[PDB]
Design a binder for these strands. Structure first.
Lengths: 160, 178, 48, 93, 222, 66, 172, 289
RNA sequence: GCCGGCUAAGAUCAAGUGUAGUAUCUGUUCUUAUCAGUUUAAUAUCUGAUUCCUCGAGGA
C-alpha cells in the first residue's frame, strides 16, 4: 500500500497499460490494477499503480496531482450537507478551507472512500454551523466551478 | 417470417416415367437422407401419385441448407434420361453359438412332435438375444448338438452367457462359442 | 453432505503444517496449497 | 482390431496382395505413396502359400509394398510383414 | 543461414582392407573401407606404388569387409554391412570404373546395436552361406549359389541366433568339401548376470562354438 | 530372444537399465569409427587392444552383482 | 520401508524440484537424479488429477480458432501468394517444454489518443509547450527514480520535441 | 464427345470405367476448356465416389483425371464444392471426398485449399471441425514435401483442435501432426513441430484403447522425424515415476523411441552419477583428445 | 455454470438396446462409523474384528 499509488479521476480513454505508460516517466511502475464494476463491467475511475520503490510513488503523487488526463481530474495519492461529483485531488483540510469562505465549519469534514481502494468514492458529507451557511452553500457552492469537476451540494435530510 | 435458409427444393421438368428410387439417388448426390417418419417426400401427382404419373414437380429435403444451396447452384437443369430439369427454392408451388446337452435322440423316437417343439423353443430363446440368421438342431447327435448363427457375435456371446448353466427339459445344457 | 464426493475429492484428511503456525489443513489438494499461502508464508517469515 | 504379423526372418521372397488389398501397405495400411516392396519369410511361400496376398490372404495380383510414412520410420526392417494372428493363423476358414 | 557441405579432401584412414582378384583376372586388388568412403587399390608392380582406382562415398558404416570369389570365379563379390541391416554384395565392373550392387538384401533395422546384425562378416572360402552377425545373439546365414549364368543367387537367411550370448569374433573355417564349419568366440553373459554373490566374473570365459550350416538341415546348427 | 531385448518395462530396476545402457553403448564403440579412433588416442592403444577391452567389459559392466 | 520425504529430500543435492508423491517410488534417488536433468521437461500436471483436464472447466468461453492475418490479410493471383507466402506473420508460441496444463491459457512518451483526450496541443517548432506534469518537475527537481530521463525546457533544448515524443532516455 | 462420354463413366464395367476415366482426363489434357463449368462439376461429383474402388487402376485413374479437372475448373469452385460435399455422403464413402480435397492440394498451390479450408473451422459444429481435421490429415499425408513451405500458418489451427475439446477431435490433430512430420522430415521446420509436440505430449494420458494409437503413432513419427535428443529429453523425467500406471506409458514410449534410433540415442542420455555400489557413470566418453 | 455455496465434481450393482469395435439409457446404494492385513504414487477397494434419554413406542 505504501509503494502503490491510488489514482482517481480516470475517464473512458484511460486504460490499464495507459496509466502504466504515463507513470513510467515518474518511476518504475511494476503493475497496474483497475477494478471493474458489476453492472457496467468497466472501470469506475479509480485505479492503482504498484511501483517498485516508495520514492517513485511519492514522486508520482507529487507530480501527477490534479492533472487533466483524458478530460478528467486525475490525481495520485498514497494508498447536514452532501457534496457529489467532487475531485479526488482535494483533501479534508482543502475541503475545510474551501468551505470556510462561505460559512463557518463545525468540525473537520469527512469524505467517503471505497472499501477496496480507499482513496475516494465520489461523495462527501460536511456539516455547517447554522442553516445560513447551508443555504449559502446550496445557493453558491451548489454549482460552482471546482478543479475540473462540477460539484453538486444538496441537503442530506429535510423535513416538509 | 423466415425468408432464407430454406430446406425445400422444387425440381421441375421431370419425365412421368420416373420412379422414386431415381429421385432418392438424385437427392443423395447433394444430401444423405430425409427419412424422418419413414422416408422422404416425392412428387405429388393428381390422385396422390396413384393414378397420374407426376404433376411436373417434385419435392426434395436435406439435413442442412448449405447442401440444398449447393445442389440448386450445381444441379440446375440436370439432364435425366427423359429430359433436362430445373431446380428452385419455392417457385410458388408447395458369431455362432453351440449348445450341447439340450435333447436326446431317444426322446424323438416315440415323440415326432417333441423335436419341432424343442426347435421352436430354441428359436424363441435365440430370438430374444438378437437376430438369428440360421438355427440348426442335430437330431442324430448323442450329445444334443445345436448351432445358432446370428448376424452379430455380441448377440451370440450374450446368448452363450445366458444359456450356460440353464436348465432345459430337466437337463443342464451348456453353451460355447464357435 | 456429499460423503462419496468427500471420499473422492480427498476429504476426511488433514496435514499438520508446523512451520505455518502448526495449522491443520485439508487433504492432498490443500496439502500442497498449504505450502503456498498467506499463513504459511507469514509463519516462514517469522521463523527466519 | 489389433492385427498381428509373422515377423520372422525376411527371406528373399517378394510380397503380393489381392485385387482389393493391393494398394495399401501390409503394415501402414495406406494407399499414399508406396516406397519399397514388402517381403515374406520361408513359411510364407511354401506349397499352398505360393502367390498369396499379404492383407487379403488369398490370391495375389500385385507386389506388396510399404507406405512412404512406414518405410521412412524403419518399419519395413521388421520380420515377415504377413498379416497372421491367432484368428488369421494357418488353420483358418 | 543455409550451409552446403564439400569434401575438399577425402578421408585417409584405412580401417579395413581385403585382397583378391576383384577385376576378374589374376591382378590383385585391395579394397580399403576408410569409413564413409570405400576405395579400391591396385599394387602396380611396374611402378611399385599402389594406385587407388575408385573412392566411392558410401554414406554408411562398413562394420566389416570379407571378399569371396565363388567356386571357379574370375572376380570376387565384396560383402559390406552398414549402420542398417542392408547387406550389400557388390562386384567391381571395370567397364567405366564404377561399382555395382549385385544384391542389396534387408536384414534388420538401422543402428549398430547389439541385437541388430551387420557387425561381423564371416565368409566360407571352401563353400558358401556367408554369416553376417551382430555382437549380441544376432547372426544370419546367407546361402550363395550359382545360377545357369553363374549368377550370385542369395538364399533365404538361416538365422541361428543364440540366447544372450555375446560374440567376440566369427570366422568360417575351410572344411573338406563338407558342411561349412563356422567358428565364433561366444560367451554366455546371461548365466553370469543372475547371481547376488559376485563370483560370476570368474569361471566364465570365452568359448569356441562351431556351427555346421549344412544344406541338408537347411539351418546353421552347432 | 529378439522380442524386446535392449529395454526393460514398467518396473525395470535402475541397475538393469544402466546395464543395457552400457551394453548397447559399447556396440556403438566397437562398431563406430569416430568413437573408436578417438578412444585409441586418449588411452594410447591400438584398435585391437581397445576393442578387446570393450568386448571383455561387456561381461557385466557398470558394477555387477555377479 | 522407504526414505522419508525429508531424508529423501536432503540426501539429494537438488531438492528444489522435489515432489512429495515422488518419494514413494521404487527408486527415489534414481527419480531425483533423472529429474535433475539440464533442460528436460517433467511429467504434465495431469499425473494425479482425475478430472482429465477437461471436465472441470468444461464451459469454454472463447472463439474456436481466430483466422490468422498471415494468410487472410479465381481466388487470387497477384495477392494470394503475395499475402500468405509474402506478408506472413511468424507464430510466436512456447519454445521447448511448455507442456499443456489443464487450462494453460486462462492463467517520456505519450500516445496520440491520450494527448488528444487530455487537451494537450501538438509540439510547436521553436517554443515552450510543456505537459502539466513538467511544471512540478521544473519546480521540485528531476525525479530520482529515472535520472537519465530528459525533458524539453529543463535538460533537452526546445528546437528535443517532435510529434508526440515529449521525452527521451539518454543512458550513460 | 463430352456429353456422350459423360454417361459412359457411370457404367459399372471395370475396364470400361478405367478407360473412360483416362479418356475424360486426357480430354482436358492439352486445351482442357471444351466444357461448361457445370458439366465438369457434375463429372467430378460423379467420379468422387469411384476414388476408392476395389481395382487400384480405377483409383489411380480417378486421381490422375481429377487433378486436371480441378486445374481446368478452378480452385475456389472445386474447393467450395468439396467443402459442401463434406456434410452429405455420410461416413461410408465420405473420406474419399476429403481425398479429393487433397487432390486439389496436389492439383493446385497450397494456398488454394489452406485459406479456404481455414474458414471452415470457424463454424462451432463438432462434426464439421472434426471433418476439417480428418481432411487436413490426408492433406498433409499426401501433400508430400510441400508442407515445409507453409507449416507455421497451419500450426495454430491444429493446436486449437488438439486442445481438451473432445475425444474424437484428438486423434485427428495427432494424425495431422504425424503425417506432417514425416512429410517435413529434415526440411527445416522443427520449430512448428516442437510447438505442436508441446500440446501432443500431454494427450498421452488417455485410457481410450482406440485413442492411444492416434497418439502412439504421432510419437513414433516424431521420434523418427525429430531425433531422440529431444523426445527422450521429454520422456526422461518419468522413466521411474512412482505411479504404476504412469510408467506403463512412459516405458512404452521409451520402447517405441528405442527400437527406432537404437544407437542414435546413445549420445543423448544424461550422466547417471556413480553410486557406491557400482560404476554407473560412463567415464569412457569424457575424454579430452 | 451463478452470485465459499447451492450435492450436475467421482466410484459402483441390476436390467434394456446395439456394434466388427467403442458404447447408449433407466433404476439404486455411497461407507456419514473405528481398528488389523492386501493394495494404491497417495486415495480407493477388498479381506476380518469391534445401557441411557424422551413420550408400549422412538432415538442414541
Amino acid at each position: 500500500q505504501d509503494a502503490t499509488v491510488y489514482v482517481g479521476g480516470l475517464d473512458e480513454k484511460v486504460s490499464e497499460p495507459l496509466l502504466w505508460e504515463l507513470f513510467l516517466q515518474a518511476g518504475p511502475v511494476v503493475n497496474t490494477h483497475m477494478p471493474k464494476d458489476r453492472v457496467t463491467g468497466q472501470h469506475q475511475g479509480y485505479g492503482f499503480v504498484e511501483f517498485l520503490s516508495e520514492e517513485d510513488a511519492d514522486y508520482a503523487i507529487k507530480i501527477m496531482n490534479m492533472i487533466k488526463l483524458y478530460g478528467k481530474p486525475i490525481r495520485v495519492n498514497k494508498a447536514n450537507i452532501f457534496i457529489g461529483n467532487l475531485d479526488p485531488e482535494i483533501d479534508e483540510k482543502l475541503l475545510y478551507d474551501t468551505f470556510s469562505a462561505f460559512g463557518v465549519i463545525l468540525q473537520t469534514p469527512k469524505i467517503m472512500r471505497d472499501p477496496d481502494t480507499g482513496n475516494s468514492k465520489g461523495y462527501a458529507f460536511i456539516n455547517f454551523a447554522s442553516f445560513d451557511a447551508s443555504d449559502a452553500a446550496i445557493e453558491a457552492m451548489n454549482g460552482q466551478y471546482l478543479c475540473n469537476r462540477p460539484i453538486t451540494v444538496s441537503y442530506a435530510f429535510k423535513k416538509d | 417470417v423466415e425468408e432464407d435458409r430454406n430446406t425445400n427444393v422444387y425440381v421441375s421438368g421431370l419425365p412421368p416415367d420416373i420412379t422414386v428410387d431415381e429421385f432418392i439417388q438424385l437427392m443423395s448426390k447433394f444430401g444423405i437422407i430425409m427419412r424422418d417418419p419413414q422416408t422422404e417426400e416425392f412428387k405429388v401427382k393428381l390422385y396422390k401419385d396413384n393414378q397420374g404419373n407426376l404433376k411436373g414437380d417434385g419435392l426434395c429435403c436435406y439435413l442442412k441448407r448449405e447442401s440444398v444451396e449447393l445442389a440448386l447452384k450445381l444441379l440446375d437443369e440436370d439432364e435425366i434420361r427423359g429430359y433436362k430439369l430445373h431446380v428452385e427454392v419455392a417457385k410458388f408451388q408447395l458369431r455362432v453359438v453351440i449348445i450341447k446337452n439340450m435333447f436326446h435322440p431317444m426322446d424323438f423316437e416315440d415323440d415326432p412332435l417333441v423335436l419341432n417343439e424343442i426347435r421352436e423353443d430354441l428359436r424363441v430363446e435365440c430370438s430374444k438375444f438378437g437376430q438369428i440368421r440360421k438355427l440348426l438342431l442335430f437330431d442324430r447327435h448323442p450329445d444334443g448338438v445345436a448351432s445358432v448363427s446370428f448376424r452379430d457375435p455380441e448377440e451370440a456371446d450374450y446368448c452363450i452367457q445366458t444359456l450356460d448353466g440353464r436348465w432345459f427339459g430337466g437337463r443342464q445344457i451348456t453353451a460355447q462359442a464357435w | 453432505i456429499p460423503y462419496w464426493l468427500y471420499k473422492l475429492h480427498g476429504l476426511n484428511i488433514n496435514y499438520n503444517c508446523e512451520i505455518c503456525g502448526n495449522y491443520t489443513y485439508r487433504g492432498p489438494k490443500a496439502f500442497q496449497r498449504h505450502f503456498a499461502e498467506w499463513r504459511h508464508a507469514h509463519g516462514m517469515r517469522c521463523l527466519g | 482390431p489389433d492385427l498381428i504379423f509373422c515377423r520372422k526372418q525376411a527371406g528373399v521372397a517378394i510380397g503380393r496382395l489381392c485385387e482389393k488389398c493391393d494398394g495399401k501397405c501390409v503394415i501402414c495400411d495406406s494407399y499414399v505413396r508406396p516406397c519399397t516392396l514388402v517381403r515374406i519369410c520361408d513359411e510364407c511361400n511354401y506349397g499352398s502359400y505360393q502367390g498369396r496376398c499379404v492383407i487379403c490372404g488369398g490370391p495375389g495380383v500385385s507386389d506388396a509394398y510399404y507406405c512412404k510414412e512406414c518405410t521412412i520410420q524403419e518399419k519395413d526392417r521388421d520380420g515377415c510383414p504377413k498379416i497372421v494372428n491367432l484368428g488369421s493363423s494357418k488353420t483358418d476358414l | 543461414m543455409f550451409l552446403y557441405n564439400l569434401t575438399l579432401q577425402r578421408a585417409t584412414g584405412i580401417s579395413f582392407a581385403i585382397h583378391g582378384n576383384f577385376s576378374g583376372t589374376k591382378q590383385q586388388e585391395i579394397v580399403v573401407s576408410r569409413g564413409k568412403i570405400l576405395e579400391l587399390l591396385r599394387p602396380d608392380p611396374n611402378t611399385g606404388k599402389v594406385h587407388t582406382l575408385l573412392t566411392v562415398e558410401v554414406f554408411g558404416v562398413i562394420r566389416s569387409l570379407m571378399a569371396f570369389r565363388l567356386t571357379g570365379g574370375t572376380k570376387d563379390y565384396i560383402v559390406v554391412g552398414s549402420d542398417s541391416g542392408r547387406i550389400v554384395i557388390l562386384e567391381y565392373q571395370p567397364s567405366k570404373n564404377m561399382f555395382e550392387k549385385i544384391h542389396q538384401e534387408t536384414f534388420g533395422k538401422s543402428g549398430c546395436r547389439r541385437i541388430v546384425p551387420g557387425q561381423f562378416l564371416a565368409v566360407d572360402p571352401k563353400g558358401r552361406a556367408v554369416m553376417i552377425s551382430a555382437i549380441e545373439k544376432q547372426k544370419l546365414v546367407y546361402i550363395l549359389n550359382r545360377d545357369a549364368a553363374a549368377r550370385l543367387t542369395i538364399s533365404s537367411p538361416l538365422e541361428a541366433h543364440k540366447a544372450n550370448t555375446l560374440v567376440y569374433h566369427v570366422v568360417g573355417v575351410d572344411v573338406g568339401f563338407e558342411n561349412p564349419m563356422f567358428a565364433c568366440l561366444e560367451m554366455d553373459y546371461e548365466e553370469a548376470d543372475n547371481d547376488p554373490t559376485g563370483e560370476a566374473a570368474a569361471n566364465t570365459q570365452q568359448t569356441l562354438t562351431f556351427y555346421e550350416l549344412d544344406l541338408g538341415l537347411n539351418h546353421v546348427v552347432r | 530372444q529378439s522380442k524386446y531385448i535392449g529395454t526393460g518395462h514398467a518396473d525395470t530396476t535402475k541397475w538393469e537399465w544402466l546395464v543395457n545402457q552400457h551394453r548397447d553403448s559399447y556396440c556403438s564403440y566397437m562398431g563406430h569409427f569416430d568413437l573408436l579412433n578417438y578412444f585409441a588416442i586418449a588411452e594410447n592403444e591400438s584398435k585391437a587392444r581397445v576393442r578387446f577391452n570393450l568386448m571383455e567389459k561387456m561381461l557385466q559392466p557398470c558394477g555387477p552383482p555377479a | 520401508n522407504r526414505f522419508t520425504v525429508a531424508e529423501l529430500k536432503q540426501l539429494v543435492a537438488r531438492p528444489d524440484v522435489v515432489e512429495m508423491h515422488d518419494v514413494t517410488a521404487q527408486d527415489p534417488k534414481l527419480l531425483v537424479h533423472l529429474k535433475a536433468t539440464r533442460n528436460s521437461v517433467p511429467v504434465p500436471r495431469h499425473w494425479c488429477f482425475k478430472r482429465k483436464y477437461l471436465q472441470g472447466k468444461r464451459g469454454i468461453e472463447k472463439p474456436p480458432f481466430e483466422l490468422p492475418d498471415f494468410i487472410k490479410r479465381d481466388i487470387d493471383y497477384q495477392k494470394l501468394h503475395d499475402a500468405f507466402f509474402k506478408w506472413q506473420t511468424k507464430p510466436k508460441l512456447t519454445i521447448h517444454g511448455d507442456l499443456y496444463y489443464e487450462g494453460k491459457e486462462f492463467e517520456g512518451d505519450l500516445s496520440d489518443e491520450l494527448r488528444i483526450s487530455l487537451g494537450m496541443p501538438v509540439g510547436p517548432n521553436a517554443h515552450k509547450v510543456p505537459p502539466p506534469w513538467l511544471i512540478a518537475m521544473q519546480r521540485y527537481g528531476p525525479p530520482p527514480s529515472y535520472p537519465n530521463l530528459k525533458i524539453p525546457g529543463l535538460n533537452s533544448p526546445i528546437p528535443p520535441l517532435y510529434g508526440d515524443v515529449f521525452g527521451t532516455n539518454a543512458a550513460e | 464427345l463430352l456429353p456422350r462420354l459423360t454417361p459412359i463413366l457411370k457404367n459399372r464395367h471395370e475396364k470400361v470405367q478405367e478407360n473412360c476415366i483416362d479418356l475424360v482426363g486426357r480430354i482436358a489434357d492439352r486445351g482442357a476448356e471444351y466444357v461448361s463449368a457445370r458439366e465438369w462439376m457434375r463429372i467430378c461429383f460423379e467420379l468422387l465416389e469411384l476414388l476408392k474402388a476395389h481395382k487400384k487402376a480405377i483409383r489411380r485413374a480417378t486421381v490422375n483425371t481429377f487433378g486436371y479437372i480441378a486445374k481446368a475448373i478452378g480452385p475456389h469452385d472445386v474447393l467450395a464444392t468439396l467443402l459442401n460435399n463434406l456434410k452429405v455422403q455420410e461416413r461410408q464413402n465420405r473420406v474419399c471426398t476429403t481425398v479429393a480435397i487433397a487432390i486439389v492440394a496436389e492439383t493446385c498451390s497450397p494456398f488454394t485449399v489452406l485459406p479456404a479450408l481455414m474458414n471452415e473451422y470457424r463454424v462451432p459444429e463438432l462434426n464439421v471441425q472434426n471433418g476439417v481435421l480428418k481432411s487436413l490429415s490426408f492433406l498433409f499425408e499426401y501433400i508430400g514435401e510441400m508442407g515445409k513451405d507453409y507449416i507455421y500458418a497451419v500450426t495454430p489451427l491444429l493446436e486449437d483442435a488438439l486442445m481438451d475439446r473432445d475425444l474424437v477431435h484428438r486423434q485427428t490433430a495427432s494424425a495431422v501432426v504425424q503425417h506432417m512430420s514425416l512429410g517435413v522430415y529434415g526440411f527445416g521446420c522443427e520449430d512448428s513441430l516442437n510447438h505442436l509436440l508441446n500440446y501432443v505430449w500431454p494427450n498421452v494420458f488417455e485410457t481410450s484403447p482406440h485413442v492411444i494409437q492416434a497418439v502412439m503413432g504421432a510419437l513414433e513419427g516424431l521420434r523418427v522425424a525429430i531425433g531422440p535428443c529431444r523426445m527422450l529429453q521429454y520422456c526422461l523425467q518419468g522413466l521411474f515415476h512412482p505411479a504404476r500406471k504412469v510408467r506403463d506409458v512412459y516405458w512404452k514410449i521409451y520402447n517405441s523411441i528405442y527400437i527406432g534410433s537404437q544407437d542414435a540415442l546413445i549420445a543423448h542420455y544424461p550422466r547417471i552419477y556413480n553410486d557406491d555400489k557400482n560404476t554407473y557413470i560412463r567415464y569412457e566418453l569424457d575424454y579430452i583428445l
